Design a protein around this ligand. Structure first.
Ligand code: R5S
Length: 290
């Protein structure tokens, strides 16, 4: 937790997310080019609301210790408490979204299911802490090596109240609506079960291999008609999901995997599977394939 700004050497931008950025830096306190490369998240507009959210995000990440969750290393700030920065381990292959698109000819279904199982175990761990991730997507999953992925960003993550199994929240700005459960679109309710709905969309993403015209936004915009503007998009999306319109089975996806997706996409919040059942089903399919 003891990083001093004078010793962080900027190398390049790695990502520009909900509104902050992640940079590759070398932490080199001895100024001899032996320090380690780390990933550094900062806010791009340090309002007090975004800053309190960022402090809570930092506390959430520091409290998580799991093989499939990116490692907290520390914090760094300038004089006062301003320009707060989160220091994390650098993962060399980048986001799963980009990795999968780049290496799709070398990544088979058994490997996708290995990633799926690691994401499920990460999410189950979050749930044991009563955290709701709210932004599960392959762009927020990072690749440490070809056999290990990690949930890599927690900017929207909330803690459940102790008396309730959901958290109601609507932030100004724009929301990844094409990953959202219907009750998150209509009532702004987020829960473990809405994370399960999004997990279904992640599984869809993996099995499309991030083909550009097959993305959830592309498919949903086609299904509702590309005329829709602004708020009409969300309205028509809600109505589409209410009539059980769903993303199609991806090319080459086995029906057993598509059935996992469609069970995650249950309109009835209480009938969606748990992350532990998802991991068991995925691991049984993996074992059958091997
Ligand atoms: N999740 C999430 C969304 C926000 N976000 C977080 C990161 C991040 N990226 C990395 N590593 C990383 C990233 C990109 C590359 C590209 C570089 C050009 N050549 C191809 C590969 C390589 C390595 N390491 C991390 C983080 C967080 C903590 N550790 C990136 N975006």
């Amino acid at each position: 937790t003891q990083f001093e700004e004078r010793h962080l050497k900027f190398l390049q931008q790695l990502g520009k997310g909900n509104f902050g950025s992640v940079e590759m830096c070398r932490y080199d306190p001895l100024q001899d080019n032996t320090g380690e490369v780390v990933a550094v998240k900062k806010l791009q507009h340090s309002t007090e609301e975004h800053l309190r959210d960022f402090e809570r995000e930092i506390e959430i990440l520091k409290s998580l210790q799991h093989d499939n969750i990116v490692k907290y290393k520390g914090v760094c700030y300038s004089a006062g408490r301003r320009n707060l920065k989160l220091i994390m381990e650098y993962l060399p292959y980048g986001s799963l979204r980009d990795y999968l698109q780049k290496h799709k000819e070398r990544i088979d279904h058994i490997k996708l299911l290995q990633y799926t199982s690691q994401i499920c175990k990460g999410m189950e761990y979050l749930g044991t802490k009563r955290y709701i991730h709210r932004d599960l997507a392959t762009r927020n999953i990072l690749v440490e090596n070809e056999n290990r992925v990690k949930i890599g960003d927690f900017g929207l993550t909330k803690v459940l109240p102790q008396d309730k199994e959901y958290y109601k929240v609507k932030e100004p700005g724009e929301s990844p609506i094409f990953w959202y459960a219907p009750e998150s679109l209509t009532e702004s309710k987020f829960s473990v079960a809405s994370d399960v709905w999004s997990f279904g969309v992640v599984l869809y993403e993996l099995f499309t291999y991030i083909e550009k015209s097959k993305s959830p936004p592309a498919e949903f915009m086609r299904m509702i008609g590309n005329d829709k503007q602004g708020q009409m998009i969300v309205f028509h999306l809600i109505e589409l999901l209410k009539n059980n319109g769903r993303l199609p089975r991806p090319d080459g996806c086995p029906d057993e995997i598509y059935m996992i997706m469609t069970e995650c996409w249950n309109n009835n919040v209480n009938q969606r599977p748990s992350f532990r059942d998802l991991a068991l089903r995925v691991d049984q399919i993996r074992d059958n394939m091997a």
